[PDB]
């Protein structure tokens, strides 16, 4: 149930 902003749309930093 995770949000896409934190998982699939997240990137390296």
């Amino acid at each position: 149930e995770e949000p896409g902003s934190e998982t699939s749309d997240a990137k390296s930093t």
Partner: antibody
Amino acid sequence: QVQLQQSGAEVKKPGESLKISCEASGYSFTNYWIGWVRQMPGKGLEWMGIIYPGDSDTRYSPPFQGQVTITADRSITTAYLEWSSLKASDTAMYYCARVGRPSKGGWFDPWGQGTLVTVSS
Amino acid sequence: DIQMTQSPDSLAVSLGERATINCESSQTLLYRSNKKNYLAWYQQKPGQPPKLLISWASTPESGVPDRFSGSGSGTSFTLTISSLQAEDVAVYYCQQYYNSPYTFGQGTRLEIKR
């Protein structure tokens, strides 16, 4: 300070191609998602799509996926929104906006001033 | 995709009185790991771009007046102007940023009631 300077207001005809720009500054261009928002005359905001300039990876909504192409350039820190063939329905205000936090999806902050694209025969 | 539905479409509140702008999402915006509602409110005044008012449902930006406040969790949400002023006349939009596409609501036009 963070600024998102956009191109001037366009007046085109149906069938013509167009490429509106958004010159970003005051932050690391690669590390944030940057996107586009449509607002037609006397209507609400419509989330078109975003792009991550670190690897040119894009996202769209179903109305605008297939209709437009969101690209970017790292050397000049400029995001784009491209039409191959304009229509009369594309007459709208096109706001540019960076996502509010680095390396992740999110709310838009800050926004650009906007580009009045007008399409008519 | 997630559909955002605000209520009402147009709102008329008198100067001094409480303005209540709701926003109902189709599926839940609360994430149980960090306990954060992934919702942002916006203020678009006439002839200007949209300005960020509130992020994370209940965290306003720096410079926003105290009369403005954002409440609710999960599906149901609310923007609350406790005492309306003349400057507050604007179209207000909610937006989820849980899953892409990060869709907006249709918008709530706030006018002065006389």
